[PDB]
Amino acid sequence: MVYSKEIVREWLDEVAERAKDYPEWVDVFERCYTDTLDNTVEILEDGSTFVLTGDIPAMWLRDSTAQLRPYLHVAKRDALLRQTIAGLVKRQMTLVLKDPYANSFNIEENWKGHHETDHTDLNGWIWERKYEVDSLCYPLQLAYLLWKETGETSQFDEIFVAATKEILHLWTVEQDHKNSPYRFVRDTDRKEDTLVNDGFGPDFAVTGMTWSAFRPSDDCCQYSYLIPSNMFAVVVLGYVQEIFAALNLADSQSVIADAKRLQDEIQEGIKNYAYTTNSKGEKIYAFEVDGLGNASIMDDPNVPSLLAAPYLGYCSVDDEVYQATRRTILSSENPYFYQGEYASGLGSSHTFYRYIWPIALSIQGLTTRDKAEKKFLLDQLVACDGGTGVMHESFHVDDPTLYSREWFSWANMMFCELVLDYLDIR
Numbered sequence: 404m405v406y407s408k409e410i411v412r413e414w415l416d417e418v419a420e421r422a423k424d425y426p427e428w429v430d431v432f433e434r435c436y437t438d439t440l441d442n443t444v445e446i447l448e449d450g451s452t453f454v455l456t457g458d459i460p461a462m463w464l465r466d467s468t469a470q471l472r473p474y475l476h477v478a479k480r481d482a483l484l485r486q487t488i489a490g491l492v493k494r495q496m497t498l499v500l501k502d503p504y505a506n507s508f509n510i511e512e513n514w515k516g517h518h519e520t521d522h523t524d525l526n527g528w529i530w531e532r533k534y535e536v537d538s539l540c541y542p543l544q545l546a547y548l549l550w551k552e553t554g555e556t557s558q559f560d561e562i563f564v565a566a567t568k569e570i571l572h573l574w575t576v577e578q579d580h581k582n583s584p585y586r587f588v589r590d591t592d593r594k595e596d597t598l599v600n601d602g603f604g605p606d607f608a609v610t611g612m613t614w615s616a617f618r619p620s621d622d623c624c625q626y627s628y629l630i631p632s633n634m635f636a637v638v639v640l641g642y643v644q645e646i647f648a649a650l651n652l653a654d655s656q657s658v659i660a661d662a663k664r665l666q667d668e669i670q671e672g673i674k675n676y677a678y679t680t681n682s683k684g685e686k687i688y689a690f691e692v693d694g695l696g697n698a699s700i701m702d703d704p705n706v707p708s709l710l711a712a713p714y715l716g717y718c719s720v721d722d723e724v725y726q727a728t729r730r731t732i733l734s735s736e737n738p739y740f741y742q743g744e745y746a747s748g749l750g751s752s753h754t755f756y757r758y759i760w761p762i763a764l765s766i767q768g769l770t771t772r773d774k775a776e777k778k779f780l781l782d783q784l785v786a787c788d789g790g791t792g793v794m795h796e797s798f799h800v801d802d803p804t805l806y807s808r809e810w811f812s813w814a815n816m817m818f819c820e821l822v823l824d825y826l827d828i829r
């Protein structure tokens with residue numbers, strides 16, 4: 404029992420009626436919305452919620468949050484699903500305590516996943532131990548949004564408090580990666596899947612920002628300060644201060660101060676190091692910097708991205724530097740911007756050349772005030788599905804029957820996000 408079929412069907416009817424002029428949107432929305440709930444979510448022995456990604460049979464801290472986020476609206480009516488989502492926070496925080504450096508986790512201590520190729524400290528709960536700053540943002544974001552959307556507070560238990568302390572500590576240690584206990588080397592010929600310098604990663608200076616090993620694409624950072632994830636960290640560090648103050652949790656005074664101090668330092672770090680200049684001389688955000696003067700000009704479709712900055716709450720969609728960044732990202736000045744017969748959009752080091760991501764099309768829609776652009780991107784999302792009726796990881800710009808990931812629940816849910824945004828559902 405993860406949700407109430409009766410309440411969810413009624414909410415869907417209400418959505419379908421709001422979107423009645425777009426039957427093509429509705430069919431895709433319902434297929435995607437139903438799939439996540441019936442096929443990716445399960446309640447464990449201990450009453451917590453394990454959420455798998457889809458066609459990779461493991462749980463990402465990133466994916467699992469984005470997967471359940473659109474259910475917050477109906478969770479205001481469906482108290483059972485509200486519990487389910489509180490159980491996901493509970494599972495996430497428990498797994499953070501298991502290993503706060505891992506992106507991905509198993510259903511139990513079973514040693515499924517990548518241990519055989521991977522040289523790092525491991526245990527049987529870990530699917531792979533690729534450290535991505537945003538992996539630790541997402542569970543704090545889910546906890547906060549569950550609280551604000553529904554009023555639920557049961558997720559804020561001793562596990563939550565301990566996991567928050569772990570995150571703050573790890574983020575602090577990673578303000579100077581020289582003190583880090585984390586190393587990762589994978590037996591592979593694909594360099595994006597391992598860390599240079601015998602697992603240490605590329606050179607950097609201290610900036611005040613917090614170091615990451617890998618991106619939310621699961622490919623490794625070129626430079627260690629990944630600006631979108633540090634943007635996300637600043638936001639969720641605000642949530643930490645709100646939750647601890649509103650709820651008088653254990654050690655509130657010390658946690659609020661530690662979180663505030665880290666937030667200020669990461670924010671000062673962004674200010675001092677995160678900006679570069681485009682071909683036209685405009686100030687823009689860099690994607691990755693090292694603090695030694697290198698700064699890449701690009702964006703990757705995975706969230707957190709530069710494109711997603713207003714979506715994650717870091718800045719206003721109206722911000723001048725964001726807008727200049729956006730124009731640079733959605734142009735050939737970005738080496739990952741691809742243009743074909745069916746669509747133009749964002750590819751990734753992680754996917755085949757010429758393949759662009761539905762997640763970034765959705766985010767592009769979510770980060771413009773322009774309703775005609777939202778409607779265009781929705782129509783294109785539906786038209787570039789290879790006749791499947793669901794969202795893929797990536798599809799060829801010249802032929803969307805060429806795609807990756809048959810079953811990618813996170814991407815299905817980002818399509819849902821944009822439809823809800825279009826119908827003014829928030």
Ligand SMILES: OC[C@H]1O[C@H](OC[C@H]2O[C@@H](O)[C@@H](O)[C@@H](O)[C@@H]2O)[C@@H](O)[C@@H](O)[C@@H]1O
Nearest residue numbers: 459507517531533595596620621622753
């Ligand atoms: O982002 C998911 C996943 O992407 C890469 O591996 C994809 C896929 O490769 C297969 O050969 C197999 O290893 C399967 O288990 C794996 O999911 C890679 O970057 C990986 O680290 C990452 O988890």
